[PDB]
Amino acid sequence: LAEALHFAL
Numbered sequence: 001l002a003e004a005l006h007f008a009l
């Protein structure tokens with residue numbers, strides 16, 4: 001989730 005979220009942002 002960490003990288004999914006930061007990628008999205």
Ligand SMILES: [Co+2]
Binds near residue numbers: 003
């Ligand atoms: Co990763």
